[PDB]
Amino acid sequence: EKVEMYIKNLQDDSLTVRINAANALGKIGDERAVEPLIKALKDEDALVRLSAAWALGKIGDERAVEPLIKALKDEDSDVRYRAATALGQIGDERAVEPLIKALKDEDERVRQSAAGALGQIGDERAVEPLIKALKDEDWRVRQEAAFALGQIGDERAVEPLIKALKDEDSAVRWAAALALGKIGGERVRAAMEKLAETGTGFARKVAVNYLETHGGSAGSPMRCLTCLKLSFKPLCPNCLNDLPLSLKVRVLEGVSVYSFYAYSEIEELIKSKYALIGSRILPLLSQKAGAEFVKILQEQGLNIPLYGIAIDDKIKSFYSHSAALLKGFCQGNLKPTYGRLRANNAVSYAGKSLEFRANNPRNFTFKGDESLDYFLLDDIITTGTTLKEALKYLKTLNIKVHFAIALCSAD
Amino acid sequence: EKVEMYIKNLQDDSLTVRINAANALGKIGDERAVEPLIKALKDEDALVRLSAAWALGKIGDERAVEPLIKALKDEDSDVRYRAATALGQIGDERAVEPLIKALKDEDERVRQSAAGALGQIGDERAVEPLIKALKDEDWRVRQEAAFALGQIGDERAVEPLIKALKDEDSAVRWAAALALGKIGGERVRAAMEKLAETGTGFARKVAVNYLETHGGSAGSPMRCLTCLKLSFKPLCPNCLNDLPLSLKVRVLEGVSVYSFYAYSEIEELIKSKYALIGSRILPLLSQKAGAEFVKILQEQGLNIPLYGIAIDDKIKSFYSHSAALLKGFCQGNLKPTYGRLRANNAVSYAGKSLEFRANNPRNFTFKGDESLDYFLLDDIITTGTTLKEALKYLKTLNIKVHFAIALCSAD
Ligand SMILES: O=P(O)(O)OC[C@H]1O[C@H](OP(=O)(O)OP(=O)(O)O)[C@H](O)[C@@H]1O
Ligand SMILES: O=P(O)(O)OC[C@H]1O[C@H](OP(=O)(O)OP(=O)(O)O)[C@H](O)[C@@H]1O
Ligand SMILES: [Mg+2]
Ligand SMILES: [Mg+2]
Ligand SMILES: [Mg+2]
Ligand SMILES: [Mg+2]
Ligand SMILES: [Zn+2]
Ligand SMILES: [Zn+2]
Numbered sequence: 001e002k003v004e005m006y007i008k009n010l011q012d013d014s015l016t017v018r019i020n021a022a023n024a025l026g027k028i029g030d031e032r033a034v035e036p037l038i039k040a041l042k043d044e045d046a047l048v049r050l051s052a053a054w055a056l057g058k059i060g061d062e063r064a065v066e067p068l069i070k071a072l073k074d075e076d077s078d079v080r081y082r083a084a085t086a087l088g089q090i091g092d093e094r095a096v097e098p099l100i101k102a103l104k105d106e107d108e109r110v111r112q113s114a115a116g117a118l119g120q121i122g123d124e125r126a127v128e129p130l131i132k133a134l135k136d137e138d139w140r141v142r143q144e145a146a147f148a149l150g151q152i153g154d155e156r157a158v159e160p161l162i163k164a165l166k167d168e169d170s171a172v173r174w175a176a177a178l179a180l181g182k183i184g185g186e187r188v189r190a191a192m193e194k195l196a197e198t199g200t201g202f203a204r205k206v207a208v209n210y211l212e213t214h215g216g217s218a219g220s221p222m223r224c225l226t227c228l229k230l231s232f233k234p235l236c237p238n239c240l241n242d243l244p245l246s247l248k249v250r251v252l253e254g255v256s257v258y259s260f261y262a263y264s265e266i267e268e269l270i271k272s273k274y275a276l277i278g279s280r281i282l283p284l285l286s287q288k289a290g291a292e293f294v295k296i297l298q299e300q301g302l303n304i305p306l307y308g309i310a311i312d313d314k315i316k317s318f319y320s321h322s323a324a325l326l327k328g329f330c331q332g333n334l335k336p337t338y339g340r341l342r343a344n345n346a347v348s349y350a351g352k353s354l355e356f357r358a359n360n361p362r363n364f365t366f367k368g369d370e371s372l373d374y375f376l377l378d379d380i381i382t383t384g385t386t387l388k389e390a391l392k393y394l395k396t397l398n399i400k401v402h403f404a405i406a407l408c409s410a411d
Numbered sequence: 412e413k414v415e416m417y418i419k420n421l422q423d424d425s426l427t428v429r430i431n432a433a434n435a436l437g438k439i440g441d442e443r444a445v446e447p448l449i450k451a452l453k454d455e456d457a458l459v460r461l462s463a464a465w466a467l468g469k470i471g472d473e474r475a476v477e478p479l480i481k482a483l484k485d486e487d488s489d490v491r492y493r494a495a496t497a498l499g500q501i502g503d504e505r506a507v508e509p510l511i512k513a514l515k516d517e518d519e520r521v522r523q524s525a526a527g528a529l530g531q532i533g534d535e536r537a538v539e540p541l542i543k544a545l546k547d548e549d550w551r552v553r554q555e556a557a558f559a560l561g562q563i564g565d566e567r568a569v570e571p572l573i574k575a576l577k578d579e580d581s582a583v584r585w586a587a588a589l590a591l592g593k594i595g596g597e598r599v600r601a602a603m604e605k606l607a608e609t610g611t612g613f614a615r616k617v618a619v620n621y622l623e624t625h626g627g628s629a630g631s632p633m634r635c636l637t638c639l640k641l642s643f644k645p646l647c648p649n650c651l652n653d654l655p656l657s658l659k660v661r662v663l664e665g666v667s668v669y670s671f672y673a674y675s676e677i678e679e680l681i682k683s684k685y686a687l688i689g690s691r692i693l694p695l696l697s698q699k700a701g702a703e704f705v706k707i708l709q710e711q712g713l714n715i716p717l718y719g720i721a722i723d724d725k726i727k728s729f730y731s732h733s734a735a736l737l738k739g740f741c742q743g744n745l746k747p748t749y750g751r752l753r754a755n756n757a758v759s760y761a762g763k764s765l766e767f768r769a770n771n772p773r774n775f776t777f778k779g780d781e782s783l784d785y786f787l788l789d790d791i792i793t794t795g796t797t798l799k800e801a802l803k804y805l806k807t808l809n810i811k812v813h814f815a816i817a818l819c820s821a822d
Contacts, residue, residue, distance in 0.1 A: 050726070078726050085687075085729065109727065116687035122631055140685060147688045153630035171682040171689075181639040202637065202679040209638035213624040219564030220533055226613065227620035228592040238649045268613040271582040274551060276499075276527035277558045278582075315461065315489040316520060318496065318527075 003030045010036050010052075018048050026055030034061045041067050046076040053079060057086025065092045072098050077107040084110055088117025096121060100129045108138040115141060119148025127154045134160050134176075139169040146172060150179025158183055162191045165203065173203040181210045189215060225281065234281050240288060247292070248409055252384050253391040255401055258296075259381055259409035260289035270380060270408055279318050282379065283328030286407050290329035293405070297333065306334050306402060309376045311362075311390065312342035326377050329405065334375070340368040341376070341390065349382065357385040364393045373400050381406035414441045421447050421463075429459050437466030445472045452478050457487040464490060468497025476503045483509050488518040495521055499528025507532060511540045519549040526552060530559025538563060542571045545587075550580040557583060561590025569594055573602045576614065584614040592621045600626060636692065645692050651699060658703070659820055663795050664802040666812055669707075670792055670820035671700035681791060681819055690729050693790065694739030697818050701740035704816070708744065717745050717813060720787045722773075722801065723753035737788050740816065745786070751779040752787070752801065760793065768796040775804045784811050792817035 006028075009021035022040055025033040033055070040052035053071055056064035064086070071083035084102050087095035095117065102114035115133050118126035126148070133145035146164055149157040157179065164176035177195060180188045193215060196207035216230045224231040226239040235243075243266065248259045263270060269285065272278025297303070308330055310322035323338055330336045343362030376390055387404050394401050417439075420432035433451055436444040444466070451463035464482050467475035475497070482494035495513050498506035506528065513525035526544050529537035537559070544556035557575055560568040568590065575587035588606060591599045604626060607618035627641045635642040637650040646654075654677065659670045674681060680696065683689025708714070719741055721733035734749055741747045754773030787801055798815050805812050 081726070088687075113687070113729075119631075120687075143683065143686055144688075147686065151631040151688075169682075171679045171686075174679045174683075175686075175689075178636055178639070182634065205637050206639065213640075220530070220562040223589075223593065225589055226616050228589065228617065229620075241652075268582045268585045271580075272554065272586075274523075275554055275558065275582075275586075276496075276524070276531075277562075278554075278586075315492060318524070 001028055003028055003032060007033055007036045010040050015045055015048070018043070018045075019051050022048060022051035022055050026051070026058040029055060029059035031059070031061055034059060034063050038064060038067045041071055046074075046079055049074065049076070050079045050082045053082035053086050057082075057089035060090050062090065062092055065090055065094050069095060069098045072102055077110055080105065080107065080110045081113050084113040084117050088113075088120035091121050093121065093123055096123045096125050100126060103129050103133050108136075108141055111136065111138070111141045112144045115144040115148050119144075119151035122152055124152065124154055127152060127156050131157060131160045134164050139167075139172050142167065142169065142172045143175045146175035146179050150175075150182035153183055155183060155185070158185070158187050162187070165191065165195055165199070170201050170203070173199070174201065174206065177203040177206040181206060184214075225278065233284060234277070235284050240284060243285065243288070245288065245292065246409075250381075250384065250411070252388050252404065253395065255391050255404055257381065257384070257387060257404040257406055258293065259406050260292070261285065261408045263380065263408050263410040266408060273321060273379065274317055276318050279321065280324070282321070282407070283324045286325050286329040286377075287331070289405075289407055290331050290334065293329075294332040294334065302402065303333060304373055307372050307374050308334060308336045309340045309374050310336075310338075311376070311378050311386070312339060314346045316346065322377075322379075325379060325407065329377060329407075337368065337374075341366055341394075349385070354383050354385070357383055361389055362386065364390055366394065366397055366399070370397060370399050373402060375403050375405065376401060377405040378407070380408040380410055382410040384411065412439055414439055414443060418444055418447045421451050426456055426459070429454070429456075430462050433459060433462035433466050437462070437469040440466060440470035442470070442472055445470060445474050449475060449478045452482055457485075457490055460485065460487070461490045461493045464493035464497050468493075468500035471501050473501065473503055476501055476505050480506060480509045483513050488516075488521055491516065491518065491521045492524050495524040495528050499524075499531035502532050504532065504534055507534045507536050511537060514540050514544050519547075519552055522547065522549070522552045523555045526555040526559050530555075530562035533563055535563065535565055538565045538567050542568060545571050545575050550578075550583050553578065553580065553583045554586045557586035557590050561586075561593035564594055566594060566596070569596070569598050573598070576602065576606055576610070581612050581614070584610070585612065585617065588614040588617040592617060595625075636689065644695060645688070646695050651695060654696065654699070656699065656703060657820075661792075661795065661822070663799050663815065664806060666802045666815055668792065668795070668798060668815040668817055669704065670817050671703065672696065672819045674791065674819050674821040677819060684732060684790065685728055687729050690732070691735070693732070693818070694735045697736050697740040697788075698742070700816075700818055701742050701745065704740075705743040705745065713813065714744060715784055718783050718785050719745060719747045720751045720785055721747075721749075722787070722789050722797070723750060725757045727757070733788075733790075736790060736818065740788060740818075748779065748785075752777055752805075760796070765794050765796070768794055772800055773797065775801055777805065777808055777810070781808060781810050784813060786814050786816065787812060788816040789818070791819040791821055793821040795822065 006021040006024045009017050012018055037052045037056050041049055043049050068083045068087050072080055074080050099114045099117050103111055105111050130145045130148050134142055136142050161176045161179050165173055167173050192207045192210045196211050212229045222232050224236040224239055225234045229236050245260055246262050250257045269281050273282055308326045310326040313321045326336045342365050347360045349357045417432040417435045420428050423429055448463045448467050452460055454460050479494045479498050483491055485491050510525045510528050514522055516522050541556045541559050545553055547553050572587045572590050576584055578584050591602055603618045603621045607622050623640045633643050635647040635650055636645045640647050656671055657673050661668045680692050684693055719737045721737040724733045737747045753776050758771045760768045
């Protein structure tokens with residue numbers, strides 16, 4: 001590195017060489033450049049003074065705090081702006097009182113950068129002056145003071161920030177709503193409830209999102225089961241989107257079988273198929289799967305009306321589980337049919353060997369129109385025994401089965 | 412409707428007619444079918460008894476509560492299961508004590524359906540018996556008791572549910588973690604902190620998501636600026652994904668100009684370009700835009716290395732705003748270049764008429780290799796004055812400008 005070369009270039013006669021040396025020492029900043037840059041703050045030209053101030057904040061050494069405090073009283077508003085920004089970047093408590101005075105500066109950029117620096121330092125002494133800054137003539141200063149109050153997290157700012165939600169500027173209302181959510185509490189919850197209902201823009205977005213996780217509280221309010229956010233469906237769209245959809249194809253009895261999820265990735269959701277609460281989760285997964293499958297059929301060219309057959313469930317389930325899973329999957333040219341195929345025995349293959357499954361068949365029975373174009377759907381495929389049996393049985397009845405869907409794959 | 416026809420079919424001699432009448436009255440359920448269905452609960456066949464019980468819960472009339480309580484002591488476990496489910500669907504407090512006894516049933520399905528019904532009713536009296544049910548031999552009963560305790564929301568269940576996070580079944584741990592998050596509090600926050608760090612599966616997912624919004628609390632912890640969730644980037648991927656990306660194309664000086672967002676949809680994020688906190692939001696938006704644009708170039712066939720030129724920013728910004736916006740956009744065959752194009756005046760067109768803009772030009776200056784394949788990038792297009800001027804200037808210098816990018820559109 002050339003750190004020591006740039007340190008020498010700070011005392012050059014050429015202005016463009018002195019400036020480039022200060023900017024270079026801001027990127028490749030070493031503690032060796034701190035003392036030479038402190039001297040560069042007393043340069044004749046303001047372009048060198050502001051570049052040295054910028055570089056000192058980028059280095060972050062506590063030695064530059066006192067000369068940067070003197071640079072807050074500089075004749076040039078660009079040098080004052082850089083000194084205020086740098087003081088917050090360093091984060092030393094000594095800059096708090098000098099930065100509080102900079103909040104009353106003539107230049108709106110110096111006021112704004114001093115407010116942001118006070119939030120970066122996080123000292124409680126800045127709370128009252130930043131509350132006054134929420135009534136500045138420049139909206140950029142108001143916005144920066146609201147953001148700084150949220151970074152400090154002092155409750156003394158709650159009522160002034162609630163009044164800032166009625167500001168004329170959209171970015172100021174947004175900064176105030178954010179600051180409120182960062183502080184939290186009962187007065188904030190009540191302000192968010194009014195802002196979500198009557199507010200607009202990004203301020204309303206913050207309020208709506210805050211109430212999804214904090215508000216709406218009740219013993220039994222409908223919530224998402226993977227993130228606990230308030231949601232009418234047991235899986236919010238964000239959580240549903242995060243579920244890994246892995247498409248696989250196997251050929252069983254000449255019929256193509258499509259799976260959409262791996263058992264290892266949705267194990268708990270599958271295990272909860274006979275739970276009261278975790279029941280309505282599977283129709284959400286099959287709706288996601290059916291939407292991708294309908295695109296596959298269009299790419300294939302299979303645009304004929306198709307009729308779904310589900311393996312009829314027994315009294316061991318809370319509701320018509322297969323009917324709900326099939327109703328969710330069906331969309332586009334897919335249409336659901338109920339009670340066409342049923343097993344004469346209620347044996348469970350879960351956790352059983354391939355030998356047990358092959359020796360315990362479900363005696364299938366078909367009851368419906370045989371001239372229709374069908375497809376069968378089931379929740380999971382482990383060994384393919386159940387599907388091979390259903391396909392073989394319907395093939396003997398001369399029934400058109402275009403494909404089979406097994407939502408989840410364990411094979 | 413045929414409600415009164417099905418009411419008569421309940422007293423038919425044919426078994427298949429009596430069953431279909433009870434099932435039909437469960438879908439097209441009227442209060443007129445309640446008294447006939449109460450009589451159908453005392454049928455000789457269990458298939459009629461369970462269908463009448465199912466239909467009574469679907470109707471939800473309080474008159475069926477007492478005969479369904481008697482149906483909890485039925486000889487058939489399928490009729491008991493249906494009576495327990497229906498009692499929770501109605502939600503009458505009178506079923507609480509009879510359902511508490513059903514938690515000790517021989518059939519694991521009756522115990523499970525009674526636990527879920529107790530959670531639907533929401534009465535506090537079920538808390539202690541449901542806590543005992545968290546130690547059932549059947550994991551489906553344990554899972555249902557954990558879900559029911561979360562629906563009641565009584566704090567007496569916190570410590571037994573914290574012990575359920577160490578259950579041998581994955582769905583039971585998941586149900587217990589959900590129930591804890593639904594109750595909330597300091598003991599829950601501490602249990603979520605250990606579960607997020609040391610747990611696995613969906614139980615860990617719930618814990619991680621709960622801590623993103625409730626935990627990690629500090630005065631200045633890095634948070635998302637649209638949902639307040641803990642996030643190192645000022646916009647979490649979920650919030651970034653929700654931002655409406657609207658691609659538009661205009662031709663300025665023969666050069667195609669691409670925009671990716673509407674000003675009306677990201678107004679506050681654009682307005683905050685010169686704010687300290689809201690600064691790093693725009694490079695996130697241009698990274699999202701550049702990822703879609705790189706797919707457009709591949710579809711077009713423009714696979715040549717392209718070099719980005721940004722309109723150089725002045726001392727009015729916190730950092731190199733254009734450099735950060737260009738660095739975020741560039742990916743794939745797009746490579747960034749800095750300080751090649753600069754305006755000799757710092758006039759601001761924001762909120763000015765088309766007349767003001769056309770009479771106040773930015774005297775552009777190019778400094779770089781002219782033989783390169785370039786593209787220019789800017790944050791917003793309102794009237795196209797700035798872009799028409801930059802393109803016209805570079806065209807006179809015989810410089811290859813393949814296209815222009817204006818992240819945001821106000822035109
Ligand atoms: O590919 P396979 O080896 O045939 O296994 C798949 C079958 O296993 C499950 O049924 P199960 O018999 O366990 O019924 P259940 O719904 O009563 O648990 C599942 O619902 C499928 O029907
Ligand atoms: O399409 P147009 O009509 O030319 O307007 C677009 C220009 O307006 C803004 O610049 P501005 O002059 O406001 O600079 P600023 O960043 O200092 O506010 C923006 O950054 C573009 O340069
Ligand atoms: Mg099954
Ligand atoms: Mg559907
Ligand atoms: Mg500009
Ligand atoms: Mg990038
Ligand atoms: Zn969710
Ligand atoms: Zn977010």
